[PDB]
């Protein structure tokens, strides 16, 4: 009985730049949104907040739902990738709390779209969705009748 991978991702935007995490993946350093897998008994939004803190040490809640991408991935691993947006007034200090992440870069949209090191092609698409002006309320993919304290 098929379940797919469920991951969350955030476009974090500040002073005309986007936040990107550098992960060395076999040998080379790749760029990604702060992003990861949903875990047990966790809201998509909570997830997105957690993986942000973990991969960058920013403390922020996702502000809107941009969109969700269903994609297969080169090694056939199936994904449902939830994409979110956070605007901050100014670039804020960062500190990854995860061994996976070499560092955080704040980078221009054109730099993302032009890059040859993106972790997946969804990293660039994410910027495109962002810049289209598309956003929606969290409530779009929100939790219904939830066992646990928010
Ligand atoms: Mn992670
Ligand atoms: Mn994770």
Swiss-Prot record:
Disulfide bonds: none annotated. The gene is nudJ. Residues 3-131 form the Nudix hydrolase domain. Gene3D superfamilies: Nucleoside Triphosphate Pyrophosphohydrolase. Keywords: Hydrolase, Magnesium. Its EC number is 3.6.1.-. Its cofactor is Mg(2+). Belongs to the Nudix hydrolase family. NudJ subfamily. This is Phosphatase NudJ. PROSITE patterns: NUDIX, NUDIX_BOX. It comes from Escherichia coli O1:K1 / APEC.
